[model samples]
Target: NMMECITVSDVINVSVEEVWKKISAFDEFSDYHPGAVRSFYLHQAADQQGSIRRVEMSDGYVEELLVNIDPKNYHLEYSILKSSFPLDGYSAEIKLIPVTQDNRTFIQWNVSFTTTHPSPEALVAEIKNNVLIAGINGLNDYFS
Candidate 1:
């Protein structure tokens, strides 16, 4: 099985709480994510595991299940249930670690998925542009 995986990280000029504020705003997830057209929790007050979220994408909407969210550790995990993504078996997590020396936030967004495409180079490029790069660049913009 071919699993395409990636983790894009950056030391954001913000505090852990600052970044947590964004992630904790679960209902407003799409406001900061460049790749999402819009998103709504299937359950209005979905705060834990099994929480389903319908994410609007370019082609259509996708359902994602929240696996876990821990503010204490500054991390969250979600699995894709449905989507137009080029890959399958999609799983992702976003974590934030504090930089003691720089007093900054380390944001790590990682994901892995299997693809049926003979080659995933093009799909990877699309993901980088539409998701990680767009989200990371928009991080500073959104956080500022």
Candidate 2:
């Protein structure tokens, strides 16, 4: 069994609360990540646990389940319920830590999973660069 964990992090040039205003909405990915998501729909209330979000992507679509969201802690976790990509057991967490010195937010996206793909490294690399890092970059651009 192959298990992998990847983390992508960056400083968003905004206060934690301001960043949360954007990241806390489970169905708002398309608002910041238009390059990857064409459209987005929520099957249930955005903040509720067990809510499912359908993200239309260039390749196809991905359905994600909101596992947990703690606004007070500025943390959330989501799992891939269904996707066009060849991945299994995929779960991710997005955490925001306040950099009080600079009045900015340090955001990190972490994913851990086992993939059935033969080329696991490339798959992980693509997810890191295109999905996770692209997401952080999108967040930065949102504030800029």
Output the number of the lDDT-best candidate: 2
The alpha-carbon deviation from the true structure for residue 57 of candidate 2, after best TM-score superposition, in angstroms, is 1.3
- What RMSD does each model have against the real structure? 1.9, 1.5
The residue ranges of model 2 lying beyond 4 angstroms of the native Cα positions read none
lDDT of 1 by residue, 1-144 (tens): 688898888888878888888776655667877778897888644456668888786766778888888989998898888887556999988999998876778889898888887779887777767787777677777878
Candidate 2 vs. true structure, TM-score: 0.93
Clash-forming residue pairs, model 2? none
lDDT of 1 at 83: 80
| 41 Cα displacement, candidate 1 (Å) | 0.8
lDDT values for all models: 0.80, 0.86
> Model 1, 22: alpha-carbon shift in Å?
1.2
Name the best candidate (by TM-score).
2
